[PDB]
Design a protein around this ligand. Structure first.
Ligand code: GTP
Ligand code: GTP
Ligand code: GDP
Ligand code: MG
Ligand code: MG
Lengths: 442, 74, 79, 78, 48, 52, 430, 442
């Protein structure tokens, strides 16, 4: 039933702002936390419970923490429109950033703030009766997102144990770039995400820019568009928990169906009707068309082409007015395709979900209003190509020790570069080996 | 007989479709540029395919909606 | 009503004709003053310049619905 | 492998969407990346009357009859 | 058959009208040339 | 999403959750079932033959 | 699809001022720079020659270079001068002296870096760059020397684009400059290596057009530069307006040039006729074709009857039938078959554009590739040999620093060009 | 039931404008895609389905793509009157042309654009349930039409396999010509058209100009007249799918009856009641008169004389008020003539089709209104003279290598000219051999 969202650093807080805007507007909670008396929701209803708790006077408050080392973004949240919605204890801010150093966040600065984060998260977890995982939003390119995200995932994994941790991560884009030191932070980051996450979803800003230029008709996109798309995706994935449907899918079903081996937990994500209002009225939108859409690489939110690898498992979430015959016909058509290939050890490649609540539309010009949508999470060996470009950039920089004195000065051994690069190399070799056909019976 | 009326008593009456400004529904108006006063602007500035797209569904060109001098036709 | 009025036919004005070969009434070699200016040097030294005015239009859009107007409008402890 | 169906990094060329097929190719036939662009080179030092232009020593272009496209890592259609 | 005959009749009439209009159009093109010619001649005389 | 049928004063036309579905689809399905039960008890062969 | 213009020397700057007047009129840009046009068709391709400045205004994508600002000072104070970007005027402190070596080596190398910086600044802003366009005379000093210098640098930097030149060439009867043969020979050597397509115009032919065809009482250089601006704006018309059969600079080059050295062309423009005669003959496609091949309307001194046509191109502007164009081009090829090279089955390409120049119902521009151009090069080579055998003015060029070996190379290259034209003229099927 | 139209370059897009104006006006779809809301005929018939699909919003949208390398023509379509009819994705435009070089289209420029085309064709073929072929319109005289048309037909032929591909092709006229390099492009084109098309219909603009001067009373025709005639021909051939009739003919029956050997697939096309409104009242237009018309060489849309060859098969499509007995009497009258000759191995020379829907009349059109029409496609040995003039012109030009440096610079071996010329020579010899009497039994 309940899930708690943890937002770290700049990207994670801004995406959290867009997400909570969406979840408020879909349930109908006023920005003051109340609910107007003219709505037909009913006082008794419970669907909000996944994301809000009431104090008993009927105000709503959300199950989230916002974590940052610089004040500016959280003070922006504090002075914005949702000021009265959040409890002030939930908005935690340090004094100064981790300055794009993973070492500064992990060793020097995050160590001071981390115990406050655990005390607030504990205060949330004590006010639950069916917590079924943590959702984490961060970028691995920056210093505090990498360092405090890793440290916090380690501490959470010791303290909470078996509870599931699902990550949405903004990875360094393959040719769009914002800072020089992105490869070092991403390599050092991937070791912690490897050990301390149950499923990891990969996002690239260059892909969401491509999707908003190509599919939407936006000449001048900004981060709010990308964050609204991410919010729509999370709302689609959690809708299966919150509303009635023909074939429900509990959050444990994603991990059970999608993950074949305990290390093979990095997944590709895509969303079908990313379409503008003018295009949406030019096209019919049947179940099979959006199912065909989620498999085109032009639809993906991570910059990888799945045609260079093999799928192991797919999980398809349908929400809205959909009928099982269309889901079955679509999956059989996908299976028919020749450019879509599954590993021969995974014959039953698909998991389905069907929910009656159509996706909510948030005021503005970034998505049409539609009666049905499908969202996909899939595990594929193609992801090894995504890591290879970071490793090439790391090798280029590390060949001259271009910046290492900063990292060594803030507390890290030089050995950690070689260790992390060898561990990510082993992850590539794992994806090479798992994708090798079973030619042992010859 | 239309081309060379001469002194004939049985002249052909005008059809009422041809006008200098090119529109049968709008009067003459002064152009923005001074050197365009003597030109038949609504007829010069129209591509051939646009003309056959607009005029195709009418037996006669005066029944077609006016061009409007706009990039998407009015 | 559709023909050109007589105010533009019964006058003598050279601006009504577009430029072409043979339209050489208003050009050099016929001016009364044929002195050569030193504009560039003066411009690069920064004591004379040209700067024509621009045009800006402030009309509001028409036909907007109720929701669009509401979207435009969107953008003490006492008991 | 270069990224597929991208809208970044091919400004100034004839391409609209680069590398839809996902193969190992340049985004466009015209050079997306060149030695020098807007910074320019030194042309004052490189012109001397003692190394003048010789007969049949002009720059080799596609119009002259030289396959420039074979010198770059752009995959042609077989 | 009767409806087809009426449709053919009205089509033929409208084609005749269009054929008249083209001949009506050419003389207005000629007038457009004539105005410019007259103004140019007047300006030349003034310059002389 | 607006409702299929007009003259609906409920702004959240489609909010089908667990509680909404039980408390709205209980009475209507029960009424349909009891109408089917009582309305089919008085069978008339003559009227059925007339309709055929 | 954006073109960058370069105007060099006195002739180039003067022709350029009239060209940009004609272009600003066609797109309805006021001399203040404000858009004042009356159809979207004018606006929708304005990018081809203009960049957009803020609140309405458009600025023209052109670089002006000269060694003394006098011509540039006049155009700036001229009626359209304000439109030009101030940073685009590049000038030195001493003249070219009508000497190629001075213009190429001493002030050329001094200024050239600022010209290349401006051209690169302009080129890298385009989303897709089409060829460069340069207007200059070959007989002058800064025009010839700095034009060919800049052409060589741009050909090093942009070898995949198109290179186009419009060029003024010495009359056969009277010289405007004594040292014309040296500057012409060296410039033709540079162009024949570097250029993709070059158009040549004789001032004597423009004088004969004005006096014989138009019967103008008091012609001025504004009229000659208007004729040039008319043909120049006509070749590019299909780039920037809709039409039934689009055409492009590269397609013209592909259809006109049989072999890469043979890229020098003759020019003509057809609708020329005096105001007194104009009442006696209506415009029609047969009339345009007859005028188009009529020597009264051709801009060179050489006559086609002494050569053969390899290829020709005609660009028509206006609302007209394609059938009439095709049958006219067939009839001209059939009736005059001895003047067309027989091992090519059809020498003429046609193209049709919807939008005529203002105040004309229809117009055509003609481009011809004819072997009679060999007589011009032969005459220039003769005059060069007469001067060079006697060292007639050579000390100026040698004093600037040129090796005499440069002159023998340029002479040999022109002689081989003449031989190649003569060989292709007399080829046969056998 | 369904057919997909592919329009390439200038001729193909301009012919597409006339085709879709006609198909809209014939079905009754308004230019904005919406049927008249007050037009309640009584039974909403399915006949549109061959050419239109609905957007679920109830708009009709057509099963076509428009392909060009230059923007101007597609932007003209985008800004015209039919803006709302087409889906914006269907109108695909590049930046710059193939500059009359087949080599530039095939090797250099079309290779960049081809994958977008394949994605659109994929999206169309997924929205079908009985696709039964592709119709392709292009000219082989220009650079992008030849090069990209060949490349695209090759890719379609590998991906789709057995699916039929029917081409409408604008061939170089025998003495009217528009560009110098036409022989090279036509020679290089014919190898691909030979391998990768099931039936190819040949057109020459000079024949349609002669037809519009002689039959219609038009002194100064332009491309819109020719394109309206082509649209009428295509509508006649596809009418058998769309309306009620006595003897229907599916496109596979066409292919089965018209093609005797797999290389012998180039066909002549003609259309009978091309007539003006003033001529229409002096003559009756019975079945036998229009059947006699389609066999006169003055009726043909390709500049060849069929009296110089032998017919192998004819397919006659009648639409309008015709009775089968009159078709049989007409065909029996044709068979008696001595200047019409069939190869002795083809005794049963005719295929018939009969449809009840009369041809539509277009308000601005130049054709009269008529109660019946017939359209013929026929396979004949006379085509061998058509190939011979290109081969002679190629030999004349290629003997001096007149333009080859362009082709070699844009990526082609000089050897490819000789290979193509030898392949077309073998096709010419095939048409010589098939027409040779079987004097083997003597
Ligand atoms: N999608 C998305 N990406 C963002 C957003 N903000 C930053 N990024 C990206 O994330 C990377 C920068 O990471 P940051 O979040 O700024 O790093 P940080 O967590 O603030 O770490 P510090 O700089 O030490 O405070 C760059 O690739 C940005 O493009 C956002 O709001 N949305
Ligand atoms: N019937 C007809 N023929 C046309 C039409 N447009 C062009 N043609 C003819 O087709 C040939 C030219 O082919 P194009 O379509 O112009 O070549 P292209 O596809 O544009 O190729 P590129 O020039 O490289 O862009 C000539 O013979 C023209 O006469 C048309 O609209 N209708
Ligand atoms: N048609 C034309 N020719 C010109 C013009 N100005 C100069 N010329 C010719 O160009 C040649 C002189 O070259 P010039 O431009 O003075 O060379 P520069 O000194 O290097 O700039 C002579 O043949 C002149 O007749 C002009 O405005 N129009
Ligand atoms: Mg930060
Ligand atoms: Mg083209």
């Amino acid at each position: 039933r309940e899930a708690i969202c943890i937002h770290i650093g700049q990207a994670g807080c801004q995406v959290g702002n867009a997400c909570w805007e969406l979840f408020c507007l879909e349930h109908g909670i006023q920005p003051d936390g109340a609910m107007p008396s003219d709505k037909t929701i009913g006082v008794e209803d419970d669907a909000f419970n996944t994301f809000f708790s009431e104090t008993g006077a009927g105000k709503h408050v959300p199950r989230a923490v916002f974590l940052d080392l610089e004040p500016t973004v959280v003070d922006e949240v504090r002075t914005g429109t949702y000021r009265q919605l959040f409890h002030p204890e939930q908005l935690i801010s340090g004094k100064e950033d981790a300055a794009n150093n993973y070492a500064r966040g992990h060793y020097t600065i995050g160590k001071e703030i981390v115990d406050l984060c655990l005390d607030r998260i504990r205060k949330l977890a004590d006010n639950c009766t069916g917590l079924q995982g943590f959702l984490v939003y961060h970028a691995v390119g920056g210093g505090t997102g990498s360092g405090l995200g890793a440290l916090l995932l380690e501490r959470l994994s010791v303290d909470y144990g078996k509870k599931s941790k699902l990550g949405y991560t903004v990875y360094p884009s393959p040719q769009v770039s914002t800072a020089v030191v992105e490869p070092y932070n991403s390599v050092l980051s991937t070791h912690s995400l490897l050990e301390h996450t149950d499923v990891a979803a990969m996002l690239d800003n260059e892909a969401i820019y491509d999707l908003t230029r190509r599919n939407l008709d936006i000449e001048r996109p900004t981060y709010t568009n990308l964050n609204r798309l991410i919010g729509q995706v999370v709302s689609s994935l959690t809708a299966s928990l919150r509303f009635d449907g023909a074939l429900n899918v509990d959050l444990t079903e994603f991990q059970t169906n999608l993950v074949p081996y305990p290390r093979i937990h990095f997944v590709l994500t895509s969303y079908a009707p990313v379409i503008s209002a003018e295009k949406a009225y030019h096209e019919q939108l049947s179940v099979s068309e959006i199912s065909n859409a989620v498999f085109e690489p032009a639809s993906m939110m991570t910059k990888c082409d799945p045609r260079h690898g093999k799928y192991m498992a797919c999980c398809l979430m349908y929400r809205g007015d959909v009928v099982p015959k269309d889901v079955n016909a679509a999956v059989a058509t996908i299976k028919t395709k020749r450019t879509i290939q599954f590993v021969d050890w995974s014959p039953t490649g698909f998991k389905c979900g069907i929910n009656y609540q159509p996706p909510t539309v948030v005021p503005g010009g970034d998505l049409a209003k539609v009666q049905r949508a499908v969202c996909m999470i899939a595990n594929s060996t193609a992801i090894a190509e995504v890591f290879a470009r970071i490793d090439h950039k790391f090798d280029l920089m590390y060949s001259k020790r271009a910046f290492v004195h900063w990292y060594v000065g803030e507390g890290m051994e030089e050995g950690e570069f070689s260790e992390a690069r060898e561990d990510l190399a082993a992850l590539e070799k794992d994806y090479e080996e798992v994708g090798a056909e079973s030619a042992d019976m010859d | 007989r239309i081309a060379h009326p001469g002194n004939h008593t049985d002249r052909i009456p005008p059809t009422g479709g041809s006008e200098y400004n090119g529109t049968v529904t709008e009067p003459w108006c002064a152009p923005a540029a001074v050197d365009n006063t003597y030109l038949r602007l609504p007829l010069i500035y129209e591509s051939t395919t646009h003309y056959q797209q607009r005029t195709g569904r009418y037996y006669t060109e005066d029944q077609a909606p006016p061009h409007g001098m706009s990039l998407p036709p009015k | 009503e559709h023909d050109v009025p007589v105010k533009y036919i019964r006058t003598l004005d050279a601006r009504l004709l577009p430029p072409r070969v043979g339209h050489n009434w208003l050009d050099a070699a016929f001016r009364s003053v044929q002195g050569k200016p030193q504009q560039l040097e003066e411009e690069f030294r920064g004591k004379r310049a040209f700067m024509p005015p621009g045009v800006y239009d402030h009309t509001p859009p028409e036909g907007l619905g109720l929701t669009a107007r509401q979207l435009m409008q969107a953008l003490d402890g006492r008991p | 492998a270069p990224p597929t169906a991208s809208t970044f990094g091919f400004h100034g060329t004839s391409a609209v969407v680069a590398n839809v097929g996902g193969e190992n190719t340049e985004p466009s036939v015209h050079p997306a990346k060149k030695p020098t662009g807007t910074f320019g080179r030194e042309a004052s030092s490189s012109v001397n009357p003692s190394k003048f232009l010789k007969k049949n020593e002009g720059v080799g272009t596609a119009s002259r009859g030289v396959p420039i496209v074979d010198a770059t890592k752009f995959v042609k259609a077989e | 058959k009767r409806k087809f005959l009426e449709d053919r009749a009205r089509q033929r009439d409208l084609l005749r009208r269009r054929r008249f209009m083209e001949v009506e159009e050419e003389r207005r093109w000629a007038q457009q040339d004539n105005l410019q010619l007259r103004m140019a001649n007047a300006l030349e005389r003034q310059k002389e | 999403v607006t409702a299929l049928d007009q003259e609906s004063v409920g702004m959240p036309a489609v909010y089908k959750s667990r509680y909404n579905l039980v408390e709205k689809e209980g009475p209507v399905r029960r009424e349909r079932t009891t109408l089917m039960l009582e309305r089919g008890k008085t069978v008339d062969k003559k009227q059925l033959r007339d309709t055929l | 699809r954006e073109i960058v213009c370069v105007q060099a020397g006195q002739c180039g700057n003067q022709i350029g001022s009239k060209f940009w007047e004609v272009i600003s009129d066609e797109h309805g840009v006021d001399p203040t720079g404000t858009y004042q046009g009356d159809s979207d068709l004018q606006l929708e391709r304005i990018n081809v020659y203009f960049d957009e400045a803020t609140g309405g205004r458009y600025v023209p994508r052109s670089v002006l270079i000269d060694l003394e600002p006098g011509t540039m000072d006049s155009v700036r104070a001229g009626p359209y001068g304000q439109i030009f970007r101030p940073d685009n005027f590049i000038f030195g402190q001493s003249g070219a002296g009508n000497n190629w070596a001075k213009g190429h080596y001493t002030e050329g190398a001094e200024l050239i870096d600022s010209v290349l910086d401006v051209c690169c600044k302009e080129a890298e802003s385009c989303d897709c760059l089409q060829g460069f366009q340069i207007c200059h005379s070959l007989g002058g000093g800064t025009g010839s020397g700095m034009g060919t210098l800049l052409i060589s640098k741009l050909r090093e930097q942009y070898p995949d684009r198109i290179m186009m030149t419009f060029s003024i060439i010495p009359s056969p009867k009277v010289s405007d400059t004594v040292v014309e043969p040296y500057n012409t020979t060296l410039s033709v050597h540079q162009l024949v290596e570097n250029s993709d397509e070059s158009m040549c115009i004789d001032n004597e032919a423009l004088y004969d057009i004005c006096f014989r065809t138009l019967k103008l009482t008091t012609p001025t250089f504004g009229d000659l530069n208007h004729l040039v601006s008319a043909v120049v704006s006509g070749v590019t018309c299909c780039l920037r307006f809709p039409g039934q059969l689009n055409s492009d600079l590269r397609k013209l080059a592909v259809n006109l040039v049989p072999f890469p050295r043979l890229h020098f062309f003759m020019m003509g423009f057809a609708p020329l006729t005096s105001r007194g005669s104009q009442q006696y003959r209506g415009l029609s496609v047969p009339e345009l074709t007859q005028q188009m091949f009529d020597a009264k309307n051709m801009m060179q001194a050489a006559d086609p009857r002494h050569g053969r046509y390899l290829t020709a191109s005609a660009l028509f502007r206006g609302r007209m039938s394609t059938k009439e164009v095709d049958e006219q081009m067939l009839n001209v090829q059939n009736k005059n078959s001895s003047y067309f090279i027989e091992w090519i089955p059809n020498n003429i390409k046609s193209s049709v554009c919807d939008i005529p120049p203002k105040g004309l119902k229809m117009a055509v521009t003609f481009i011809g590739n004819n072997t009679c151009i060999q007589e011009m090069f032969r005459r220039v080579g003769e005059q060069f040999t007469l001067m060079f055998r006697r060292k007639a003015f050579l000390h100026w060029y040698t004093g600037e620093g040129m090796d005499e070996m440069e002159f023998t190379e340029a002479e040999s290259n022109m002689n081989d060009l003449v031989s190649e034209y003569q060989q292709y003229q007399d080829a046969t099927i056998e």
